[PDB]
C-alpha cells in the first residue's frame, strides 16, 4: 500500500527543474563561451534538439528499459509510452511519473555533456546516430546496472548521483569520439554557475525524498565543490604563478563531479577531502585527443570520486557506513569495477554509435 | 475547516518563483536577442517598470476583482490590497497568500510578453496606459472567466494553465497593437532556456498542489516541449534544408504554449500528438503585421492547444477524463468558445487601451 | 522530541539552492556589466574564490560561532566541522544540516556584495586576507547577535532577513574599502534578475518553514520590489526626465533590501510603503567615496528598512503586531540601536581587515 507522500512530490519536481536547468541552457552555455565563436549556433541547436530527442526517446523506451524489471543489464518494454504506469502509481515515497521526470532529466544532461564536447566537429545527422546509440546501449543499461537494481547495485556498488552513469559513461564516450575524429568566458562561469545550482537538484535529488540524505548530499555538495575551487586555485597559482577564471570554474566542476557518486554516503569531513583531491587531480589531469578536456574533469575525477566513496562511506571516517557484511576492502574493489565496467561499457557502445554514424551519414562535419 | 497543507505551501512559492523568473529576466533576454541592438536597453526598462507596475495593479486590486466572488465576468473589490484575507486564509491547500502571489505571477509573464513585442515600437507613457487598460479589462475578466469560477469555466471549459488567459489573450492583444502600429542568438536561447524551466512552475503550479497531476503536467510539459522541437526542427530542415537555432528554441515554445491548456488533461501520448501539432502549426503560422511573431506562436499555438485539449482530456485517448455527461463532442464546442470569447474579448479591449494612450499621449514613439 | 518536517525540509533546501544562486551568478553578474571590461574576468575569479573559501570556513568554525550557545556576541567551537550535529539533529522544524546549508549561503552572498564592489582596487590575497577578518569578527558575531539568539535578539530587534546582518554590514565594510583606498547593461540586468528570484529564497526561507509567514514574506517581497522600481523610475524621470535601466534595475534592489528586515513582519500596505520610501531614498542616496554605489543603496536602504520595520510590524498599521509589552517608541529605538550596533562594529572590523591586508601584502592591486 505505497503511499506518495507531497512533500517529497514537491522536492522531486524542483530538484528535477533543477537537473532540466543544468542542460538547458547549462551545459550549452558553459561549452558556449569555450568553443570557437564560429561554430556556437551550431552547438546550441545540437544540444537542444539532442535534448528533446533525449526527452521523448526516455518516454517511449527509455524509462521502460532503465528501470523496467528485467535482468542485470537492461529492464523491459512494457512501460512503453509509460503505459501500465497508473497516474498514481508510487515509487519510492513520490509518484512514479516524477521518478520518470527525474532519471529522464539526467539521461539529458549526460548527453548534453557529450553533445556539447563534440558538436564542433560532429556533423549533425551523425550526432542524432551517435545519441541514439549510446543512450540506447550505453546510458540506459549502466542506469540500469546502477541504479535500476541491475549488476552492480546487486553487488553493492556505491553511486549515489552518478560518477558512473553520467561522468565516467559520458567522460569515455567523449574520448573515444575524439580518438575517431576560449572566446566568452563570462558565458563560460554563467554556466558554470547554472550548473552549480543546478547540481542541487542532482545530488539532493537522488535521495528520493527531502529527508536528512538530501541534507547530506546538499551540505557535501557545497563543502567539495568550494574545497575543489580552491585546491585547483591554489595549484594553479603554483603551476602557473596565479588563478584564473577558468581555473576557478573548472574547480568548482571538479569537485561537484567528484562528490556526485560519494554525496549521500559521506561526512563533510569527507566532503572537503574528497574536493581538495578531485580538484588538484582535476588540474593534473587538463595537464595530462580529449575535447573540451571532458575526460580530464569528468572522466578523472569521475573515478577519484568513486574510488574515494569506497571508503569515506566508512563510519570511522564520518560517513553512513558501509553494508553489513561489507569492509572497506571489499567495498574499494566494488567501485573499481563498477568503474572498470562503465569504461568499457560506454568505450565499446560509444565505438560502435560513431562508426554507425561513420558508415551511414559520415562523422566528419563537411 | 480548511487546512493548508505546507507540502503545498512549498510547492507553490516555489512555483510561483520560477514563473516570476519568466518575466525577470525569461521574457526579456529572449526578446532582448531578437530586437534591434538599439532598442535593448528602452525594452528591458519597459519590461521591468510594466512588471513591477502589474505586481502593484495586482495587490490593490487586481487578485480581488480576478478573484474574488462576483458575476461571471469579474470578482469584486473588498480583497482591495488584500483586506478581509486573513493571513491564515486558506485556498485549495494552499495558504491564500501564496495563490495571490502565484496568479500574480501568471498576470506579470502575461504583461511581459506584450509589452517585449511591442517595446521596441511604442511610446513608454502609451505602454503604460495600455497596461492599466488591458490588464485591467481584460487580462482580470479573462483570468475570472476561466480560472476564477466565471463563465468560461463555469461551462466547463479546459484550461490547465492559461491557453486562453495568457497566450491567446495577449496574442491578440499584440496583434492590434502592431495592426494600428535577430542580433543576439546566444541571448535569445537563453531566454529560452529560462523560459522553458520557469515553465514548470506555471504548468505543474496550476495543479495548486504536488500530486499526481502536477506530476502529469510536468512530465506532459517535458514530453511536447520536446515534441514541438522536433516537429519543428524537421519541418525546418524540410523548408529550409536546415535546422536553425531560432527554430529550435522557437518549437519549444510552440510546444510548450500547447501544452499549456493541456498539460493537466492529457496523456503522455497527447502530449507528444499535441507538441508535434503545436511544432508544426507554430512553424506554419510564422511562415503565413505581427510584433515578433507573438500570433503567429501564441495565438496559433493557443489555439491549437485549446481544441486539442477537448479532445486529448478523454480517457479513451489516455486523459483524465472529461467530466460527467460531457462528451467530446460538447468539449470542443466549449474550447472553440472558449478561444473565441478570448480573441474579441482581448481584441476590442486592445483597441481600447491603444486608442485612449494615443489619444492622450501618443502611440508612435517621438 | 523534536521533530523534522519533509514539508520544510523541502523548501529550506530550494531556498538555499535560491540564495546560492544570488551569488553564483548573481552579484557576479550584476557587478559584472557595473565594472570596467578589463577588471571583470579578475572579478568573477575573485568572488568565485572567495565564495569557495566562505563555504569552507562556514564549515570549519563559521556555523559554530555564529549558530553554537555561547555569549551575547558569539557562540562556541565545539560544531567544529559540523562534529556533535548528528544528521538527524534537528532544528526548528528541519534538519540542522539545512541551517548550515541556508545560513552558509547567506555569509556567501553578504561577502559577495562586498568581494564585487572592491574587486577593481583590491589586490587578491589582500581581499582574501579581508574575507578571512571580516567574516570572522564581522558577519559571525552579528549573525550570533542578531539571529543567534545573542545580544540584539535578546533586546528584541526586528531583522527578518538581513537589513543588519547582511545590508548594513557588508554596506560599511565597503564603505571603509573605497575610504582607505556601466559597459554591459544586459549584463547587469540579469543579475539583478537571478538576485530577484534568489531573493525569495532569501526572504521565504528565513521563516525556517512553508508557512503563513513565508508566504507573506514572499509577497512583502514581490510588493516592495515593485513599489521601489516605480519609486526610484519616478524620481528618476523627474530629477532626469527620464526611467533608465540601471535606475529601475537599482529601483528592484532598493526595494528588496529595504524589505530585508521587515518581510517577515508587516502587511502589504507596509511593503508597498517601505518599497517607495526605499527606491526614493536609495535614488536619493546615489544622487548623494562609495565603490558601484554599495552603501549608497545597501547602507542607505538597510537603514530605512530596519528602521521602518520598528513602525510596520505593528498590528495597526497591518504587521504581525509588536512582541508583548512592546511599543512602538520601544521597538523603534532598539532598532536604532541594532542600526549603529552594525554600523560601528563592522566599521572597527573592516578598518582592523584591510589594514592587516595593507600589513601583510597591500591593499593597492599592483
Ligand atoms: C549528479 C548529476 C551530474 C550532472 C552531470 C553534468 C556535468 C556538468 C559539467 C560540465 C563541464 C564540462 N567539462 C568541460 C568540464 O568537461
Ligand atoms: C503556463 C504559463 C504560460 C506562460 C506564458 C509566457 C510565454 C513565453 C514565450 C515567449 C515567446 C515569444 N514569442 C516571440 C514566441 O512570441
Ligand atoms: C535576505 C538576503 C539579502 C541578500 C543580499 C544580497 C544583495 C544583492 C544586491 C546587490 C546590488 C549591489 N549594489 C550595487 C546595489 O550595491
Not at 550549452?28 to 530527442?53: C, D, H, P
Not at 556498488?157 to 574520448?175: C, E, K, R, S
Not at 552549480?196 to 537538484?201: A, R, S
Request: glycine share 14%; proline share 2%.
Amino acid at each position: 500500500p505505497a503511499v506518495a507522500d507531497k512533500a517529497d512530490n514537491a522536492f522531486m519536481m524542483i530538484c528535477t527543474a533543477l537537473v532540466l536547468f543544468m542542460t538547458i541552457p547549462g551545459i550549452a552555455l558553459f561549452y558556449g563561451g569555450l568553443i570557437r565563436g564560429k561554430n556556437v549556433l551550431s552547438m546550441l541547436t545540437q544540444v537542444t534538439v539532442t535534448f528533446a530527442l533525449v526527452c521523448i526517446l526516455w518516454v517511449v523506451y527509455g524509462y521502460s528499459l532503465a528501470f523496467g524489471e528485467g535482468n542485470n543489464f537492461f529492464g523491459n518494454i512494457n512501460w512503453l509510452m509509460l503505459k501500465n504506469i497508473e497516474l498514481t502509481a508510487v515509487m519510492g515515497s513520490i509518484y512514479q511519473y516524477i521518478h520518470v521526470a527525474f532519471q529522464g532529466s539526467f539521461a539529458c544532461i549526460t548527453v548534453g555533456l557529450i553533445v556539447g564536447a563534440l558538436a564542433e566537429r560532429i556533423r549533425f545527422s551523425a550526432v542524432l546516430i551517435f545519441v541514439v546509440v549510446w543512450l540506447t546501449l550505453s546510458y540506459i543499461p549502466i542506469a540500469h546496472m546502477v541504479w535500476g537494481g541491475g549488476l552492480l547495485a546487486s553487488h553493492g556498488a556505491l553511486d549515489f548521483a552518478g560518477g558512473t552513469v553520467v561522468h565516467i559513461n559520458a567522460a569515455i564516450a567523449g574520448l573515444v569520439g575524439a580518438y575517431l575524429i576560449p572566446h566568452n568566458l563570462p558565458m563560460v562561469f554563467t554556466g558554470t554557475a547554472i550548473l552549480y545550482i543546478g547540481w542541487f537538484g542532482a545530488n539532493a535529488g537522488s535521495a528520493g525524498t527531502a529527508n536528512e540524505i538530501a541534507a547530506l548530499a546538499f551540505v557535501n555538495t557545497v563543502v567539495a565543490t568550494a574545497a575543489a575551487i580552491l585546491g585547483w586555485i591554489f595549484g594553479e597559482w603554483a603551476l602557473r604563478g596565479k588563478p584564473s577564471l577558468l581555473g576557478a570554474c573548472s574547480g568548482a566542476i571538479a569537485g561537484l563531479v567528484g562528490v556526485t557518486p560519494a554525496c549521500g554516503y559521506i561526512g563533510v569531513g569527507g566532503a572537503l577531502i574528497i574536493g581538495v583531491v578531485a580538484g588538484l587531480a582535476g588540474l593534473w589531469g587538463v595537464t595530462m585527443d580529449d575535447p573540451c578536456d571532458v575526460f580530464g574533469v569528468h572522466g578523472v575525477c569521475g573515478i577519484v570520486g568513486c574510488i574515494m566513496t569506497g571508503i569515506f562511506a566508512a563510519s570511522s571516517l564520518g560517513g553512513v557506513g558501509f553494508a553489513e557484511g561489507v569492509t572497506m576492502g571489499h567495498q574499494l574493489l566494488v567501485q573499481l569495477e563498477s568503474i572498470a565496467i562503465t569504461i568499457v561499457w560506454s568505450g565499446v557502445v560509444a565505438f560502435i554509435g560513431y562508426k554507425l554514424a561513420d558508415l551511414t551519414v559520415g562523422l566528419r562535419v563537411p
